Amino acid sequence: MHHHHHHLVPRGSVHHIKRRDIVLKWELGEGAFGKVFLAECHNLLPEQDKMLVAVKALKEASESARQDFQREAELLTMLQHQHIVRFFGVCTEGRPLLMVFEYMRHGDLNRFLRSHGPVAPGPLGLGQLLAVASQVAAGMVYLAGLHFVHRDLATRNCLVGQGLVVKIGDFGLPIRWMPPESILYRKFTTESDVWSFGVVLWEIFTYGKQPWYQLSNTEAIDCITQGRELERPRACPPEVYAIMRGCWQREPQQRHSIKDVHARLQALAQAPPVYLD
Numbered sequence: 001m002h003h004h005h006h007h008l009v010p011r012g013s014v015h016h017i018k019r020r021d022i023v024l025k026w027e028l029g030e031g032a033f034g035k036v037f038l039a040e041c042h043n044l045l046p047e048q049d050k051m052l053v054a055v056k057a058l059k060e061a062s063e064s065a066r067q068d069f070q071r072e073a074e075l076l077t078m079l080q081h082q083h084i085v086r087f088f089g090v091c092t093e094g095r096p097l098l099m100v101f102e103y104m105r106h107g108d109l110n111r112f113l114r115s116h117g118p119v120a121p122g123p124l125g126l127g128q129l130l131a132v133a134s135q136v137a138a139g140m141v142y143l144a145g146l147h148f149v150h151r152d153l154a155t156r157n158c159l160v161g162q163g164l165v166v167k168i169g170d171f172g173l174p175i176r177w178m179p180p181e182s183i184l185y186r187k188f189t190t191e192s193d194v195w196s197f198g199v200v201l202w203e204i205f206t207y208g209k210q211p212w213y214q215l216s217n218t219e220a221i222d223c224i225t226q227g228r229e230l231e232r233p234r235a236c237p238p239e240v241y242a243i244m245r246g247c248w249q250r251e252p253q254q255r256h257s258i259k260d261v262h263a264r265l266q267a268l269a270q271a272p273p274v275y276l277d
C-alpha cells in the first residue's frame with residue numbers, strides 16, 4: 001500500500017496520545033480508511049488545556065492493516081509544512097486504532113469552492129482564488145522536495161482553515177485528475193502530480209466543478225488518453241490558463257516544474273491581473 005514511499009526513511013518516533021486524552025464529539029465523515037470524528041484533545045500542546053482535532057478511526061484489526069497503519073503514521077510524522085495537514089500522532093491503546101490531525105474548521109476545499117461560488121460568506125474573488133491556488137502549489141513544492149508522490153491531488157483532498165489557510169491531505173482510481181501515463185501505465189511521479197495540480201487549478205477556477213463533467217467515466221478515460229485538454233474556465237485569466245497548459249504537456253518531462261508554477265502563482269496572487277469575465 002505504501003511501497004512507493006520506501007525511499008522515505010523516518011528520523012524519530014511517532015507521537016503517542018493516551019486514549020483518555022481524546023474526547024469524541026461527532027462524525028465529520030468517513031470514506032475509504034474509516035470514520036473521521038471531530039474531537040477535543042487534552043495535553044497535546046503545553047499552552048492549551050484542550051483543542052479541537054480530527055480523529056480517524058481505523059476499521060480493520062487486521063493485522064495487515066495494522067502494519068500499514070504504523071507505516072502510514074511514520075510517513076505522516078515526516079510531513080511538516082504550513083500547507084500540509086498537521087499530523088499529531090496516534091492512539092494505539094486498544095481498539096479502534098486512532099490517528100489525530102489538526103482540525104480545519106471550514107472542511108474540504110471542494111465543498112468550500114462550491115459554497116463560495118458566483119469565514120466571510122459570498123463569492124471568492126480573483127485574489128482569493130489565486131491565494132488558494134498558491135497555497136496548494138506551496139504544499140506540492142514541499143512534497144516534491146521530499147520525493148513524496150501524492151497520487152490523488154484534488155480539491156476534495158485539501159482542507160480550509162481559519163483565515164482561508166489551505167492544506168493538502170488525502171482522505172481516500174481518480175481518473176479525471178490523472179495524466180495518460182498514470183491511466184495507461186500506472187506511472188505516478190512528481191510529473192503526474194503536476195498534471196493533477198493543473199486539474200486542481202481548473203477546479204479552483206470553475207468553483208469546484210468536476211473535471212470532464214460533460215463525459216461518462218469511460219468517455220473521460222478515452223479523452224485523456226487521446227490528448228483532449230480541459231477548456232479555459234470563464235473566471236480564469238489568460239495568465240492562469242497558461243499555467244494549466246504548462247502542467248498538461250503530454251510528455252511528462254515537458255511539464256512545468258511545481259517550483260515555477262508556485263512562483264508564477266505567487267506573483268499573480270500578490271498582484272492580481274485586472275481580468276473580468
Ligand SMILES: CC(C)n1cc(C(=O)c2ccnc(NC(=O)Nc3ccc(F)cc3F)c2)c2c(N)ncnc21
Binds near residue numbers: 036104168
Ligand atoms: C474532510 C474531513 C472528514 N476531514 C479529514 C481530516 C483529516 O485531516 C484527515 C482524515 C483522514 N485521513 C487523513 N489523512 C491524511 O491527510 N494523509 C495525508 C496527508 C498529506 C499527504 F500528503 C498524504 C496523506 F496521505 C486526514 C480533517 C481535518 N483535519 N479537519 C477537518 N476535516 C477533516
